[PDB]
Amino acid sequence: MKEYTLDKAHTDVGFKIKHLQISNVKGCFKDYSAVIDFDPASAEFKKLDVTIKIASVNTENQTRDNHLQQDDFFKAKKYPDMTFTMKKYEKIDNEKGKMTGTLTIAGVSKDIVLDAEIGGVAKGKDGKEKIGFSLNGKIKRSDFKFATSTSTITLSDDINLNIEVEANEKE
Amino acid sequence: MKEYTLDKAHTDVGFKIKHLQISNVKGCFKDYSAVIDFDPASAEFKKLDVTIKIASVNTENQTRDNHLQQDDFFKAKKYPDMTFTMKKYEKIDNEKGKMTGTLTIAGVSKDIVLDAEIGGVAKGKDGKEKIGFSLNGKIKRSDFKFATSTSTITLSDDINLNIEVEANEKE
Amino acid sequence: MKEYTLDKAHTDVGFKIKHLQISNVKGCFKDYSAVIDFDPASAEFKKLDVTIKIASVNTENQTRDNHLQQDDFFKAKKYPDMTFTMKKYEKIDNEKGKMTGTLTIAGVSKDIVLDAEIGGVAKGKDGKEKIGFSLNGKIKRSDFKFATSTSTITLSDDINLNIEVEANEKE
Amino acid sequence: MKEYTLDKAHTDVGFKIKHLQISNVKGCFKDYSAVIDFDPASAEFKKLDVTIKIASVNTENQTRDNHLQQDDFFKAKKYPDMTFTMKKYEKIDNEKGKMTGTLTIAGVSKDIVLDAEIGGVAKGKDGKEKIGFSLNGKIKRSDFKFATSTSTITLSDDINLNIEVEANEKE
Hints:
4 copies of one chain form a homotetramer.
Chain A: E1 2-6, E2 12-29, E3 32-39, E4 44-53, E5 57-58, H1 62-68, E6 81-91, E7 96-105, E8 108-123, E9 129-140, E10 155-169
Antiparallel strand pairs in A: 2-5, 3-4, 4-6, 6-7, 7-8, 8-9, 9-10
PDB class: unknown function
Keywords: nanotechnology nanoporous, unknown function
Assembly: tetrameric
């Protein structure tokens, strides 16, 4: 038997413990097209049709973006683009209305409601029109059989859409 | 009715989705004392008794460390220190043995097994002894009624102990 | 050395593994009062004020109901009842409208939107009026600092309200 | 405007909220073979080699068992059986020892340690030998690239082995 004294400098009294952390993935699409018909006399949308290139996704992370394109997500090879087609705008007042339309994600289509909020209608610098509005709403991955392999525990079943639009008149 | 064209520069086609991520909290204690009795003739521990100042915790994060001291964790005001007392060392070979002892966390005591691995026995520069060994083992929060408020989902019930020791002879 | 043969009848080749499962808690309140003013000429609500006795909760489970009354949830001793007060009904059509009101949970108050769906307006058997409608909407625990101790991982931050009402005229 | 009174009998003041629950899957295998060489003079194992038919899994649930056989788990078509081969038994005392061996799950092989606990050595009714022992240890899914598609959040990375054996002498 012999007695020792720790060398505190090369001793580590250590532990490891596993925890969960919840976080929002925020993202946009860099490339999309839209057709916008709007009547400032009555603050009603007449036609709103959007096409989004799945390829142009951006969640501030290079390799998750690539991963989004694969079979367990978008299947961008087979289904390059997602689309929204307005079917009905039901006015609440000049600032607010309920928009109903058909969303299509990887070939599966469902009708969704978005909350339209008109953040501002104007005549621009040059005397030609502008508008600024938002579309907001929650859709469920499950309604679109989207990313079915991934559990609703790991990744939320709810996707929150925030479409923020500025837009100028045509020709 | 009037037709518009998105201004892609001030338009954001955006989404938010919640996901979970698992991660290890790694930590040590900066301040502890120990008594170490070891027989290099037989590579057996004879006495190993450790006291750790809960206050000296470090998980590379200032405000979690403070939080660790509160009621839902250590209760460092009431129970300033955690202690380990060896009761039995059962040798496997010169490199390996099973250590049994009493761990006390916030006044609750349980007997635990650690896996002793002797990483090296030597005579130092000055002809006085040194040893380097590790103690490893898993303990359960639940066995110590520790952090009972926190679910075993958020934070794992299993804590992994890694004690890495270098140590020199006495007097 | 000696050779043995398993007795398959008293041998168990076993394993244990921990998994997570997501589930909806569904619940109602057995005891509440309400004041309902509604104009069948225009299908507009005029006044809707509800008081719910927290005590009368029911989630098909005896001991969770008790637990709901405690500090980490409702605090029913201090705050026996939750209340809803309509501030505005904005009509969409005769079947649908957006209801805005003040919800109060344990003394904290926030304005919420519910989706009113009029499932049917009638003159009853006896020539006196009836109506059947639903109020639906999502509120966030966090907006009401509700059950703050419980993580948004264990229990969802989103509560989904489904108020299903049948109701007859007065005097 | 007109005033109504709830019909409490056909009114439901309801809510839905999502929570997580952690649970142990307990399971065994109904069909396996083993070779057991053991020396009661010294309480040492000499050879222990086990083959388990993945097909014979049982987790008290019909359709999860089927699911276990598929690509995201066992791949029982390609890899019908898992195997354990003892490489070393290191004795602690007559009741306890550390067993090291090669586990093979779906063609991937790793060396694992089990804790042998001899629950009893005897001469049976007929004067022929019996033994009762347990093998216990934790293995990591990740070490065997097992069920890689499933997150370590949904399903724990740690599998706990409990092999409980009764066994009689040969010929």
